[PDB]
Design an enzyme around this catalytic site. Structure first.
Site, PDB file in Angstrom:
ATOM      1  N   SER A  26       4.505  -8.378  14.440  1.00 49.47           N
ATOM      2  CA  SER A  26       5.537  -8.597  15.693  1.00 49.47           C
ATOM      3  C   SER A  26       5.358  -9.928  16.397  1.00 49.47           C
ATOM      4  CB  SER A  26       5.409  -7.622  16.449  1.00 49.47           C
ATOM      5  OG  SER A  26       6.017  -6.304  15.846  1.00 49.47           O
ATOM      6  N   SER A 104      -1.003  -6.229  11.661  1.00 50.31           N
ATOM      7  CA  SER A 104      -0.241  -5.440  12.887  1.00 50.31           C
ATOM      8  C   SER A 104       0.909  -4.605  12.231  1.00 50.31           C
ATOM      9  CB  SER A 104       0.236  -6.528  13.794  1.00 50.31           C
ATOM     10  OG  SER A 104       0.174  -5.637  15.103  1.00 50.31           O
ATOM     11  N   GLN A 105       2.131  -4.561  12.605  1.00 48.96           N
ATOM     12  CA  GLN A 105       3.383  -4.211  12.058  1.00 48.96           C
ATOM     13  C   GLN A 105       3.446  -4.348  10.458  1.00 48.96           C
ATOM     14  OE1 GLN A 105       8.185  -3.689  12.225  1.00 48.96           O
ATOM     15  NE2 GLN A 105       7.278  -4.395  13.915  1.00 48.96           N
ATOM     16  N   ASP A 159      -9.990  -2.948  19.200  1.00 49.55           N
ATOM     17  CA  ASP A 159      -8.524  -2.740  18.736  1.00 49.55           C
ATOM     18  C   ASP A 159      -8.146  -1.445  18.823  1.00 49.55           C
ATOM     19  OD1 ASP A 159      -6.015  -3.437  17.851  1.00 49.55           O
ATOM     20  OD2 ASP A 159      -6.491  -4.370  16.057  1.00 49.55           O
ATOM     21  N   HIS A 172      -7.049  -7.192  18.693  1.00 53.53           N
ATOM     22  CA  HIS A 172      -5.984  -7.074  18.031  1.00 53.53           C
ATOM     23  C   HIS A 172      -5.410  -8.588  17.501  1.00 53.53           C
ATOM     24  CE1 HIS A 172      -2.808  -5.399  15.940  1.00 53.53           C
ATOM     25  NE2 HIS A 172      -1.805  -6.002  16.610  1.00 53.53           N
TER      26      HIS A 172
END
Length: 201
Positions: A26, A104-105, A159, A172
């Site tokens: 993202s 991540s996403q 994270d 993260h």
């Protein structure tokens, strides 16, 4: 560098041995973000610029911040875009070894796309790397319907997205070393083994 469309703009006359399809996080720029080009450079160093195609998931995958809250951690439109690359690779270059990744996403996207893709194509995906995997807890550190031996998750201590939270803390944002080292090494090991086996047949 931050955008690669080697597969989308490639043709069956010039198929490489390996095709890498990668989904960014993202807010990230281009179709590779910050970690994609790191993994790409190490693959290119091993296979040569003509021996691997690098392909980011762009198009309908906008990496929207709110889509992280959806059950699978990304949208169906984004999954469709990644599945489209898997299909295009299988059709254009049916003898190519596929590898995948995401952050991540993008890691939720890569996992969902790998789950959903036709089983014939999934067999050709020799390995997948996931950075800051947002569905790590929920999927018990795996990709559903895909072998654990072909999967490598990088989830830093602290994270919180890896332990079921929708919260982004500093760990993260610390996958640069993994991206430049352990992750491509894993993908190279898996792809080399897949290629060797096909030459045997």
């Amino acid at each position: 560098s931050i955008t690669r469309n080697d597969l989308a703009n490639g043709n069956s006359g010039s198929c490489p041995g390996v095709i890498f399809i990668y989904a960014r996080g993202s807010t990230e720029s281009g179709n590779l973000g910050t970690l994609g080009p790191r993994v790409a450079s190490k693959l290119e160093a091993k296979y040569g610029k003509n021996g691997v195609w690098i392909q980011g998931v762009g198009g309908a995958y906008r990496a929207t911040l709110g889509d992280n809250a959806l059950p699978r951690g990304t949208s169906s439109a984004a999954i469709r875009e990644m599945l489209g690359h898997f299909s295009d690779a299988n059709q254009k270059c049916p003898d190519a070894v596929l590898i995948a990744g995401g952050y991540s996403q993008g890691a939720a996207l890569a996992a969902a796309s790998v789950t959903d893709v036709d089983a014939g194509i999934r067999e050709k995906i020799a390995g997948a790397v996931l950075f800051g995997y947002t569905k790590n807890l929920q999927n018990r550190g795996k990709i559903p319907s895909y072998p654990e031996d072909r999967t490598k998750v990088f989830c830093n201590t602290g994270d919180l997205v890896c332990t079921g939270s929708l919260i982004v803390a500093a760990p993260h944002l610390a996958y640069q070393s993994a991206a430049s080292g352990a992750a491509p090494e894993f993908l190279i090991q898996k792809a080399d083994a897949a290629g060797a086996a096909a030459a045997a047949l």
